[PDB]
Enzyme design. Structure first.
Site, PDB file in Angstrom:
ATOM      1  N   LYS A 148      -0.059  -2.405   8.350  1.00  0.00           N
ATOM      2  CA  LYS A 148      -0.758  -1.385   7.570  1.00  0.00           C
ATOM      3  C   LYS A 148      -1.311  -0.301   8.488  1.00  0.00           C
ATOM      4  CE  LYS A 148      -3.950  -2.371   4.231  1.00  0.00           C
ATOM      5  NZ  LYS A 148      -5.191  -3.080   3.816  1.00  0.00           N
ATOM      6  N   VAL A 204       7.111  -0.694   2.373  1.00  0.00           N
ATOM      7  CA  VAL A 204       7.032  -1.621   1.233  1.00  0.00           C
ATOM      8  C   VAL A 204       6.168  -1.117   0.064  1.00  0.00           C
ATOM      9  CG1 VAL A 204       7.655  -3.691   2.569  1.00  0.00           C
ATOM     10  CG2 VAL A 204       5.248  -3.087   2.308  1.00  0.00           C
ATOM     11  N   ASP A 234      -7.077  -8.444   0.342  1.00  0.00           N
ATOM     12  CA  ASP A 234      -8.101  -7.519  -0.181  1.00  0.00           C
ATOM     13  C   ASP A 234      -9.468  -8.138  -0.520  1.00  0.00           C
ATOM     14  OD1 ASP A 234      -6.019  -5.638   0.060  1.00  0.00           O
ATOM     15  OD2 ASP A 234      -5.543  -5.699  -2.084  1.00  0.00           O
ATOM     16  N   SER A 288      -0.887   2.767   3.862  1.00  0.00           N
ATOM     17  CA  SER A 288       0.484   2.404   3.499  1.00  0.00           C
ATOM     18  C   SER A 288       1.014   1.321   4.433  1.00  0.00           C
ATOM     19  CB  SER A 288       1.388   3.636   3.536  1.00  0.00           C
ATOM     20  OG  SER A 288       1.208   4.361   4.741  1.00  0.00           O
ATOM     21  N   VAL A 289       1.884   0.457   3.910  1.00  0.00           N
ATOM     22  CA  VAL A 289       2.355  -0.721   4.646  1.00  0.00           C
ATOM     23  C   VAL A 289       3.861  -0.687   4.909  1.00  0.00           C
ATOM     24  CG1 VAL A 289       2.406  -3.263   4.713  1.00  0.00           C
ATOM     25  CG2 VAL A 289       0.452  -2.117   3.737  1.00  0.00           C
ATOM     26  N   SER A 340       2.107   0.057  -1.341  1.00  0.00           N
ATOM     27  CA  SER A 340       0.650   0.238  -1.303  1.00  0.00           C
ATOM     28  C   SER A 340      -0.095  -0.867  -0.565  1.00  0.00           C
ATOM     29  CB  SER A 340       0.088   0.348  -2.723  1.00  0.00           C
ATOM     30  OG  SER A 340       0.522   1.541  -3.340  1.00  0.00           O
TER      31      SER A 340
HETATM   32  C1  LHJ Z   1      -0.966  -5.538   6.312  1.00  0.00           C
HETATM   33  C2  LHJ Z   1      -2.282  -5.910   5.617  1.00  0.00           C
HETATM   34  C3  LHJ Z   1      -3.496  -5.624   6.245  1.00  0.00           C
HETATM   35  C4  LHJ Z   1      -4.706  -5.952   5.632  1.00  0.00           C
HETATM   36  C5  LHJ Z   1      -4.701  -6.569   4.383  1.00  0.00           C
HETATM   37  C6  LHJ Z   1      -5.995  -6.951   3.669  1.00  0.00           C
HETATM   38  O1  LHJ Z   1      -5.958  -7.550   2.594  1.00  0.00           O
HETATM   39  N1  LHJ Z   1      -7.119  -6.601   4.284  1.00  0.00           N
HETATM   40  C7  LHJ Z   1      -8.443  -6.899   3.713  1.00  0.00           C
HETATM   41  C8  LHJ Z   1      -9.534  -7.272   4.713  1.00  0.00           C
HETATM   42  C9  LHJ Z   1      -8.901  -8.352   3.839  1.00  0.00           C
HETATM   43  C10 LHJ Z   1      -3.491  -6.854   3.759  1.00  0.00           C
HETATM   44  C11 LHJ Z   1      -2.281  -6.526   4.363  1.00  0.00           C
HETATM   45  C12 LHJ Z   1      -1.111  -6.845   3.676  1.00  0.00           C
HETATM   46  C13 LHJ Z   1      -0.466  -8.041   3.979  1.00  0.00           C
HETATM   47  C14 LHJ Z   1       0.697  -8.396   3.307  1.00  0.00           C
HETATM   48  C15 LHJ Z   1       1.488  -9.452   3.403  1.00  0.00           C
HETATM   49  N2  LHJ Z   1       2.466  -9.295   2.516  1.00  0.00           N
HETATM   50  N3  LHJ Z   1       2.326  -8.234   1.909  1.00  0.00           N
HETATM   51  C16 LHJ Z   1       3.180  -7.867   0.958  1.00  0.00           C
HETATM   52  C17 LHJ Z   1       4.386  -7.241   1.276  1.00  0.00           C
HETATM   53  C18 LHJ Z   1       5.263  -6.885   0.252  1.00  0.00           C
HETATM   54  C19 LHJ Z   1       4.934  -7.160  -1.074  1.00  0.00           C
HETATM   55  F1  LHJ Z   1       5.778  -6.819  -2.057  1.00  0.00           F
HETATM   56  C20 LHJ Z   1       3.737  -7.788  -1.395  1.00  0.00           C
HETATM   57  C21 LHJ Z   1       2.864  -8.147  -0.373  1.00  0.00           C
HETATM   58  F2  LHJ Z   1       1.700  -8.755  -0.675  1.00  0.00           F
HETATM   59  C22 LHJ Z   1       1.235  -7.580   2.317  1.00  0.00           C
HETATM   60  N4  LHJ Z   1       0.586  -6.357   1.991  1.00  0.00           N
HETATM   61  C23 LHJ Z   1       1.109  -5.442   0.945  1.00  0.00           C
HETATM   62  C24 LHJ Z   1      -0.595  -6.003   2.681  1.00  0.00           C
HETATM   63  O2  LHJ Z   1      -1.167  -4.948   2.406  1.00  0.00           O
END
Ligand code: LHJ
Length: 341
Positions: free
Chosen positions: A49, A26, A164, A33-34, A28
């Site tokens: 991630k 997907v 984040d 990478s996610v 960044s």
């Molecule tokens: C997998 C993950 C792990 C950790 C964190 C995080 O914020 N950690 C810090 C400690 C608080 C965030 C994510 C995370 C979750 C989600 C959910 N949805 N999307 C997502 C998917 C497509 C898109 F186009 C946009 C989107 F936001 C996510 N993305 C891009 C992510 O990176």
């Protein structure tokens, strides 16, 4: 211990359990990478991630530990919470990779404001959810510090989650939402730094354009001061930073603009909120808990569905450790993770 399987996804090799299938990249994330996936056990679609070389340095490893400890603690509808964490490593000795697994959303507010007309209600729901996550986030003595559209994941049916949390020059969008105090290094600024970032987002949702699109730290502060006015004698002696206080005084003093003339064709109650969110002195910004009571959210405010969190343990933040001691700390947390009901 489940079976793992290997797959090459964009020049990097992912090793995951059978339960995660249909892996599509997907883009960044924060320090990795996610990929999107279908979790065949729980039935949810999930974002996974993979952290990129998380133990190559001390500054990296502490941050690897920091991120996992945040998510473990976060159990709220509007805040990204951890659904799973795993590692293909069999023992601490071979252990190098961390995969975090959370809920999946369609996009963030960057990819939607483009081709959407947003009714006054869309804003009501969207902002209410941000502040609801914030009230919870701030109750665990946590600040986001870098709240912006790109970290507000969103659904087709307008559901929102915050990414984040707890974790920069020229004409860039990552700076346009900062509270002036953290942007320019002023003081023990507090939680209400994020309430400024809301005010800036809400406005962009109400007007369809950025509130303070500055070309540098200075050009932006000037844009902010044009609207909210220049500080009075009260806020001067609160800035405990020599060089910053000296610069603010040297500026030509400006009065507070009339907020109704800026965001137009918008709900008067929305306007009155923004005035209470864009206050310059962060000892006088409206708090999250206070913001939900505002009559603007009258049709969503449900006090019994606005919970706070348990105090967060941040004593690990004031410790000087080596790589392998952060590594071991982290290893322990990963294998000691128990998934929700
Ligand atoms: C997998 C993950 C792990 C950790 C964190 C995080 O914020 N950690 C810090 C400690 C608080 C965030 C994510 C995370 C979750 C989600 C959910 N949805 N999307 C997502 C998917 C497509 C898109 F186009 C946009 C989107 F936001 C996510 N993305 C891009 C992510 O990176």
């Amino acid at each position: 211990r489940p079976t793992f399987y290997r797959q090459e996804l964009n020049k990097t090799i992912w090793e995951v359990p059978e339960r995660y299938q249909n892996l599509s990249p997907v883009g960044s994330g924060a320090y990795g990478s996610v990929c999107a996936a279908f979790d065949t056990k729980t039935g949810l679609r999930v974002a996974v991630k993979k952290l990129s070389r998380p133990f190559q340095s001390i500054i990296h490893a502490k941050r690897t530990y920091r991120e996992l400890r945040l998510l473990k603690h976060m159990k709220h509808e509007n805040v990204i919470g951890l659904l799973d964490v795993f590692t293909p490593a069999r023992s601490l000795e071979e252990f190098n990779d961390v995969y975090l697994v959370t809920h999946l959303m369609g996009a963030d507010l960057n990819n939607i404001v483009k081709c959407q007309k947003l009714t006054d209600d869309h804003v009501q729901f969207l902002i209410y959810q941000i502040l609801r996550g914030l009230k919870y986030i701030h109750s665990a003595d946590i600040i986001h510090r870098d709240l912006k559209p790109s970290n507000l994941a969103v659904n087709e049916d307008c559901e929102l989650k915050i990414l984040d949390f707890g974790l920069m020059t020229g004409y860039v969008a990552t700076r346009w939402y900062r509270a002036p105090e953290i942007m320019l290094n002023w003081m023990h600024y507090n939680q209400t730094v994020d309430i400024w970032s809301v005010g800036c987002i809400m406005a962009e949702l109400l007007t369809g354009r950025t509130l303070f699109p500055g070309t540098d730290h200075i050009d932006q502060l000037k844009l902010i001061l044009r609207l909210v006015g220049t500080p009075g004698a009260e806020l001067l002696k609160k800035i405990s930073s020599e060089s910053a206080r000296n610069y603010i005084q040297s500026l030509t003093q400006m009065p507070k603009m009339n907020f109704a003339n800026v965001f137009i064709g918008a709900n008067p109650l929305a306007v009155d909120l923004l005035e209470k969110m864009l206050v310059l002195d962060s000892d006088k910004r409206i708090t999250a808990a206070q913001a939900l009571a505002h009559a603007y959210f009258a049709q969503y405010h449900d006090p019994d569905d606005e919970p706070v969190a348990d105090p967060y343990d941040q004593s690990f933040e004031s410790r000087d450790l080596l790589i392998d001691e952060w590594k071991s700390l982290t290893y322990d947390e990963v294998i000691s993770f128990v998934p929700p009901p």
